[PDB]
Amino acid sequence: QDLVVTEDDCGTHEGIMMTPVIEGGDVKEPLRDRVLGRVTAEDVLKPGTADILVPRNTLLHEQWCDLLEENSVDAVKVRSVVSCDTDFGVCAHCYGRDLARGHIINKGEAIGVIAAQSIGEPGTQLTMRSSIQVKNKGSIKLSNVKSVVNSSGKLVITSRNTELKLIDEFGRTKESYKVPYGAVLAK
Amino acid sequence: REEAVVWDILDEVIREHPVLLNRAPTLHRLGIQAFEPVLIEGKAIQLHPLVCAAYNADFDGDQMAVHVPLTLEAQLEARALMMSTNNILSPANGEPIIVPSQDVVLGLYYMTRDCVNAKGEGMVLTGPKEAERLYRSGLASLHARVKVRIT
Amino acid sequence: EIKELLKLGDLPTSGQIRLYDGRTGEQFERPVTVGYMYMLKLNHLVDDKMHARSTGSYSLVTQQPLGGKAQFGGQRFGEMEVWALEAYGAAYTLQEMLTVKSDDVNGRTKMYKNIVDGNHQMEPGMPESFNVLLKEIRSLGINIELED
Amino acid sequence: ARVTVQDAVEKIGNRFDLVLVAARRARQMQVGGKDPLVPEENDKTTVIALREIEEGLINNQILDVRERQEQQEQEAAEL
């Protein structure tokens, strides 16, 4: 209701971290839809690591997203409105594209109202009323592990919060899973 | 009195005067769009079909209202912003909202198809103009696979 | 049984006669259905829905257009599309939507004079209905004012 | 004629001050006694105004020049 794009930059470096979502099977929303058209928090550190793929304030249109795509960029921190340091408003370089105009947002077009209508409109079209079996072939990465190898050689984990990721051949995550307390892993 | 001079006066004043059409469940921001009138023998608004997909408006009896921008700034706001050529991409997503909905895609999916054996199989044609000259002649099939020259 | 009934007539068992355009004069490929459908006219006729208003009567408690057609009244430019005008950058459109064309009696006299002279310009003034609301809240035990 | 206001945005990168520059100019062509600076097609003041924005001979700066310079004509005629 109240929220007018009123400055050009906040001049900060906070933001959130976009990763493509993996519900537990296939990737269901890829990176180049969530990232597409938003201004980076800091530069993209390419996995040629200490290579700077894009700079720290560049709008990521389709070319830059393709260069992110070829070098398999894993997680991208990005300027969001939630962390935008604008006073009484939203700066331009924390919002990005209008999505109806193929460039940065102009100073003023109140994204609060276009936000709320664009959220609430498809609500007329909504509804109202064991183990782990991996799928593809890649490397296994574990997250926050506290484990022990049993008497037979299978691994079991003494921490609930350990997450089972299947990294691909390149280095991004392509599967993610929950491993409970004292679960008999095969690998 | 409805004289035959004032229809010419109205044809003067509605040469470049946009109007703001609205549909009553005005959900998202495409619900009011500007247009230019072209006067119609009849009593119902004729409305461009692509815009129907933006208006969520089939022709089962939907009723749309017209408003008129009076002042000059309002006409410039209509033509600059709310003209229908501007709104081609939704603010929800970068997808086109000018999607060809239902008949036109049937015409295409019937047009760009291919059966294996019909009139004019495998012949050669210098360009698309001989293709349309074949189809309007009724000498070749609409959907039969042909090598042509394209540029 | 419908196929047998068609077999009683001369009309084909497929049911679909080939047809010819009146413009091209040549055959529609893939023959099409014809028949007799029993159809109805409904009483939502257009001349009981088509309606317009330049400037007619104004309502009494609020200097606003009347509602309906039997009273020769305007359309309701409702709330959701005020939000939709907020969604565009259209301000002057809205500012004449709910001040000149709607509420302030002085501003639409000025507007009517300016159109018939050939000027396109608005003089806002103030919505009458907001001033009515001000006298309502003020008509309770509430001091409400405007500053400079 | 008029189909888009694309190139007007291509010379004025705001798409909102397009409306104020255009309203200032076409107001200066309807009320004020000034000719169009472009050949017309018996168009209205609006498409003439945006059409002059298409050729880039008007933006906010030139309008500042004409308000200031015709303003000094209103100073020099005052004596």
Partner: peptide, 16 residues
């Protein structure tokens, strides 16, 4: 204070 009127409140807030 949204679009064209945001330029207008740039003017009015710029004056006071």
């Amino acid at each position: 204070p949204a679009g064209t009127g945001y330029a207008y409140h740039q003017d009015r807030m710029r004056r006071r």
